[PDB]
Amino acid sequence: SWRAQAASRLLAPLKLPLVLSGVLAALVTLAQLAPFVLLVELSRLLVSGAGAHRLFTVGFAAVGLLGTGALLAAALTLWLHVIDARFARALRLRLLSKLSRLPLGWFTSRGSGSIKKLVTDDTLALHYLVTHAVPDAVAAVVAPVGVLVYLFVVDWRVALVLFGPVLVYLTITSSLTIQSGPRIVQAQRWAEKMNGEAGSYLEGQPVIRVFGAASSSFRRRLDEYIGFLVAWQRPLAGKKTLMDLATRPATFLWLIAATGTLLVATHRMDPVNLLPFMFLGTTFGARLLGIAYGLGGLRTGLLAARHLQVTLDETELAVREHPREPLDGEAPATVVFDHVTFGYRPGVPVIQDVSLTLRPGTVTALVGPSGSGKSTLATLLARFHDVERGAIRVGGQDIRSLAADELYTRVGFVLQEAQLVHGTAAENIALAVPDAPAEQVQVAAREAQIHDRVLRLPDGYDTVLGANSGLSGGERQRLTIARAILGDTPVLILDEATAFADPESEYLVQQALNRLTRDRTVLVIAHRLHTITRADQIVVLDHGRIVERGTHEELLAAGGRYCRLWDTGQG
Amino acid sequence: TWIALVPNDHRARLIGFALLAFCSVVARAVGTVLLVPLMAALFGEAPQRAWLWLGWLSAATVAGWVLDAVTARIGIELGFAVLNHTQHDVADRLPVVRLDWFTAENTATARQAIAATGPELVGLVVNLVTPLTSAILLPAVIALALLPISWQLGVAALAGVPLLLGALWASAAFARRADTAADKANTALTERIIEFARTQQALRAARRVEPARSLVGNALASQHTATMRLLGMQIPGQLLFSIASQLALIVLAGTTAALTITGTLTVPEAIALIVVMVRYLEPFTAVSELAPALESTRATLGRIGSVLTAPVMVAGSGTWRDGAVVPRIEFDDVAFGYDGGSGPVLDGVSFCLQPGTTTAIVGPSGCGKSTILALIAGLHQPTRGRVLIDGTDVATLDARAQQAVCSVVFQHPYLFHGTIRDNVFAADPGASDDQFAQAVRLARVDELIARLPDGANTIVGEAGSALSGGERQRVSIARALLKAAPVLLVDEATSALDAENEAAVVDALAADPRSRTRVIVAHRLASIRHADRVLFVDDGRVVEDGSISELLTAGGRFSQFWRQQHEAAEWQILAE
Numbered sequence A: 001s002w003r004a005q006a007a008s009r010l011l012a013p014l015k016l017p018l019v020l021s022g023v024l025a026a027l028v029t030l031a032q033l034a035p036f037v038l039l040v041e042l043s044r045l046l047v048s049g050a051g052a053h054r055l056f057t058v059g060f061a062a063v064g065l066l067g068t069g070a071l072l073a074a075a076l077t078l079w080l081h082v083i084d085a086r087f088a089r090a091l092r093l094r095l096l097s098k099l100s101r102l103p104l105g106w107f108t109s110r111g112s113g114s115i116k117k118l119v120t121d122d123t124l125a126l127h128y129l130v131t132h133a134v135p136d137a138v139a140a141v142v143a144p145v146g147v148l149v150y151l152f153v154v155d156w157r158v159a160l161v162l163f164g165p166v167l168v169y170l171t172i173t174s175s176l177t178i179q180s181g182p183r184i185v186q187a188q189r190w191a192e193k194m195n196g197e198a199g200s201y202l203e204g205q206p207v208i209r210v211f212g213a214a215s216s217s218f219r220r221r222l223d224e225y226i227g228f229l230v231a232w233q234r235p236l237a238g239k240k241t242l243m244d245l246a247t248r249p250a251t252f253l254w255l256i257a258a259t260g261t262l263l264v265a266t267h268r269m270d271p272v273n274l275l276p277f278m279f280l281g282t283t284f285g286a287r288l289l290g291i292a293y294g295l296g297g298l299r300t301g302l303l304a305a306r307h308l309q310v311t312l313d314e315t316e317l318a319v320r321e322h323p324r325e326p327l328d329g330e331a332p333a334t335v336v337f338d339h340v341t342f343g344y345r346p347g348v349p350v351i352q353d354v355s356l357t358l359r360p361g362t363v364t365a366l367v368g369p370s371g372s373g374k375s376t377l378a379t380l381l382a383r384f385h386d387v388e389r390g391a392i393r394v395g396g397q398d399i400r401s402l403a404a405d406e407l408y409t410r411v412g413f414v415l416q417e418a419q420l421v422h423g424t425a426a427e428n429i430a431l432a433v434p435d436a437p438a439e440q441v442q443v444a445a446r447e448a449q450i451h452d453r454v455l456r457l458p459d460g461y462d463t464v465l466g467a468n469s470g471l472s473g474g475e476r477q478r479l480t481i482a483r484a485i486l487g488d489t490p491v492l493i494l495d496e497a498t499a500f501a502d503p504e505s506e507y508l509v510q511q512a513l514n515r516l517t518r519d520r521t522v523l524v525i526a527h528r529l530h531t532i533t534r535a536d537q538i539v540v541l542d543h544g545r546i547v548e549r550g551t552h553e554e555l556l557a558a559g560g561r562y563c564r565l566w567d568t569g570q571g
Numbered sequence B: 001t002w003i004a005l006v007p008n009d010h011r012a013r014l015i016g017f018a019l020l021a022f023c024s025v026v027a028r029a030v031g032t033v034l035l036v037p038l039m040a041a042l043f044g045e046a047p048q049r050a051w052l053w054l055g056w057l058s059a060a061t062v063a064g065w066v067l068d069a070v071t072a073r074i075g076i077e078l079g080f081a082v083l084n085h086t087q088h089d090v091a092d093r094l095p096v097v098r099l100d101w102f103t104a105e106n107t108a109t110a111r112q113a114i115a116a117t118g119p120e121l122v123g124l125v126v127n128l129v130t131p132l133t134s135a136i137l138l139p140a141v142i143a144l145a146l147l148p149i150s151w152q153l154g155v156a157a158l159a160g161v162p163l164l165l166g167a168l169w170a171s172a173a174f175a176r177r178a179d180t181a182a183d184k185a186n187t188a189l190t191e192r193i194i195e196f197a198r199t200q201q202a203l204r205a206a207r208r209v210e211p212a213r214s215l216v217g218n219a220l221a222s223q224h225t226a227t228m229r230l231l232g233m234q235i236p237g238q239l240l241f242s243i244a245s246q247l248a249l250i251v252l253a254g255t256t257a258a259l260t261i262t263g264t265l266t267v268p269e270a271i272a273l274i275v276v277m278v279r280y281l282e283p284f285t286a287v288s289e290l291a292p293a294l295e296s297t298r299a300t301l302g303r304i305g306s307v308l309t310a311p312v313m314v315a316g317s318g319t320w321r322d323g324a325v326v327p328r329i330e331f332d333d334v335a336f337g338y339d340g341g342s343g344p345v346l347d348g349v350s351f352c353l354q355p356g357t358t359t360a361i362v363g364p365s366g367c368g369k370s371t372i373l374a375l376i377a378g379l380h381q382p383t384r385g386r387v388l389i390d391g392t393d394v395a396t397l398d399a400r401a402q403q404a405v406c407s408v409v410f411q412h413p414y415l416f417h418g419t420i421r422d423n424v425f426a427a428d429p430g431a432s433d434d435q436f437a438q439a440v441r442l443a444r445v446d447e448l449i450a451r452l453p454d455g456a457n458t459i460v461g462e463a464g465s466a467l468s469g470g471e472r473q474r475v476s477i478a479r480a481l482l483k484a485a486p487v488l489l490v491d492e493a494t495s496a497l498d499a500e501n502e503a504a505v506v507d508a509l510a511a512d513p514r515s516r517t518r519v520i521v522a523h524r525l526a527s528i529r530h531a532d533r534v535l536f537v538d539d540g541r542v543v544e545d546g547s548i549s550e551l552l553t554a555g556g557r558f559s560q561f562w563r564q565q566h567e568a569a570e571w572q573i574l575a576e
């Protein structure tokens, strides 16, 4: 990656606060380091005369440095937190405004865990980045540089003889990293697999508790995992300890002591000019490790910001493209299809040139082998994704040329995923029409076979819902069916799988549907094709395009694929 | 409590490693005490008499090198040992954790603790234990060794150690508290967004997207109210220790200067002591540089802590003399509420079943109907009651033998990552392929094993694997028929648009030599018609414990269920 890359560089509006904070952190770190120079100056004084006044001066200087360091650190923390809070608020507003505009299909493509992960996890990770990683890394990179400059200013020979351990450490670590190529990716793959193993073992717990001999597989996989970990780590242990030895302050201490004793005994060192190394020379080994630590640490936040930005710069709906001026076919609910071709990926197309027209008051059905673009078509009809070629009009008026309000004003649908918005059960039934006069809600709930249950609820038509509401799948589906009945939109979409979702509470849902589809242009995604025998127009489709449409009796009297699906068990 | 336990049987290795670490520490400490005379000589009129002390320091250095090399080797060994032991212990102690503990997040916790803690432990041994302990112990022994050289300055370090350690720990605690407050506030903030994004379809479909959006945005812009406590309690987490360290340095240097200005130790000694003071103060910063690693490891091992310190169900005490060829499952005055998400579901039910007689359970959905098939299998514990399989309790059983009485056909089937044959052979590993063939033929699944490539052996575990719904439910049925146990609990699985599954269930019900007591919660009339003692469970209590022929023509709610099933299988969407 690089700069000016607007797929990871969404954190551009705070580049100037970031550089000012970097400068402030560099100043804070130099103020942290200064006490050692003050100590060296104190020693230089003490070694020759230096009446009490001169030492008191150094004490006052040290107190001043402590004070200004603490003050600068506090200022830096406050400023960073302020700018981070402001940016996070702006980002939350931007993300919500974006989320209010993505096409519905995206949601039932990501899911629920991914949504939460993205929003809260990435927001927290980016906030942690801005508040901790950047200043800590700036400090970790600015401290060793300063120490090194100060050391070379004092005496350019002890620094050279001190480089040794750093050199051998670099040598051994390069050897190890080029000597572990396969094992690292192998262990990564092992981890990704063992995650699935753990998931499956935790899922199938009753099966393990009843059939106790079905645990063998996971235990063997875990044994192989730990054996691989051992056979990986155990060999490169001597190399690791021999390379971790040339970081110990003992080694740098011995080096410095030896070279200083050599230079002083030969009277070419001015021993008072050796104390800087003695003080800030042993931890130079750990300084570079800290460099690597921080520079690696500022990576999770970066990748999180990149993912959040590639989410933000999504492609919203083309909506309102130059109104089609509704044609003269018919404009009640006569929905007509066209040469429609659509694919989830820019490659393989799932749908190909359907072009089927529904009439007002007709019931059409879709029948294909499960996984043959059977639901994708009805899903497209409700503007979950834009088509790639061809048009789709509701009343001879292209759906893309329709406001998101005007569209769903007439294309109400009942798919899976009841999707209860937690609130007043009465208001949750009357979500469609904002304020029904408390009687429409009741009669709709009575005509959706849910009134008795919602009265059996603890309180009644005020009960705030939730995870612990107690409602079952059938109960929630009937609530949403009541809401759709109250909606009263004269074009409907039935996912027939909603009927036989709760196999016990199924007759009541069937009655609710029979009441819901009394006057519509229902488009049924029929799974069990016996429920579609009096439908006005059957449409079988397989692997995309339509093959043949008609009524049940005719299509059965003309043999292809439908006599096939019919004779299969049903005869 | 029990978080990371070494084998705890071979005390020798542990005590040897401990004394070896202590020896490395005392060598690293005598390093600076040997620095003292060297630096004292390097300033006097005769700096040529420091070669002896340099040689002694070199001796101490090579001793420390050998010592800590051996210590690192022992550390890596013990790390492998502890990884192996604790991973086996964690994976061993999860058939016994009480089943209602696996909540929505307690499951993710255990998943992480199982599949994310290898490298964490193999580094936890050395990278955590040895530096943290050595750097803590080093200042104390430094002071102890500094007592003979200069008493008034030795006790100063011994007074300093507790204060600096307390300051360090207080800074760490402040940091942790500020961080948890921060991310808690962040979650409180960005939960409404998750809520508005979950229900984005119903809102959009009901033309209520802009008011909800404006409401959430108004709330966001309204609350604000940050800073003050957050910023105020986030500040100290580094200033505390930074101040404390610089202050200790100032105080020690001032003490040394005061004692070399009053004429108690000549100028060269004061310089050496000033150097030794920085040597003494270094390990505290070395420890303070280990705060984030320690916190990460603390969380990672808190995962294992939560896993191991989970509740356990025990029955034990030994029973099951012979085998009770055909038992009789009665359990009277029983109640069982789900600990966690409470509510007295299934309170006070009682029914004595019969040996070898199918007993179908039928009722409204979500009425505590699979909890009964759990309690019968002994997979759960009744709060106030007693399951009485064959006139004996089920909690008076050695766990190894209480799982050899039932065989369940669980609602949601689970096939672990292996092959179909291995799944079917999970019931009785020591079976013969003839019994396996009989089962795979009786479960209406031979056509499935012959309707796939390469035969029976097939990667089936996950990722579709060509297995879909009824296709794997029939494998589960074939597996539950192999385990010879004198009880067969069959909780129906939803298998719409598939009649082979229902036919296999009817076959398991009718044609079976075993002649075992069976319990089949089902709804479909075909499955329900082959029983002879039906229970109607409505809201955690049996209502119509009669029989088909007498429940139809006499009572209610069951003519209701019967007519609903009979006229719900002929509902076709008319073109009206």
Ligand SMILES: Nc1ncnc2c1ncn2[C@@H]1O[C@H](COP(=O)(O)OP(=O)(O)O)[C@@H](O)[C@H]1O
Binding pocket: A108, A109, A344, A350, A368, A369, A370, A371, A372, A373, A374, A375, A376, A377
């Ligand atoms: N979220 C998705 N991402 C990518 N491809 C998908 C997604 N959902 C479905 N598909 C694919 O689109 C095609 C249409 O499937 P679908 O219309 O759901 O089938 P059916 O209606 O028969 O159940 C299939 O190839 C399916 O795998």
Ligand SMILES: Nc1ncnc2c1ncn2[C@@H]1O[C@H](COP(=O)(O)OP(=O)(O)O)[C@@H](O)[C@H]1O
Binding pocket: B100, B338, B340, B341, B345, B364, B365, B366, B367, B368, B369, B370, B371, B372
């Ligand atoms: N793990 C659980 N934690 C809390 N409540 C649960 C749990 N499992 C089931 N329940 C609840 O216990 C009741 C009994 O459900 P159950 O008998 O399994 O229903 P079903 O007849 O559909 O199998 C229901 O209200 C259900 O929501």
Ligand SMILES: [Mg+2]
Binding pocket: B369, B370, B411, B491
């Ligand atoms: Mg069930």
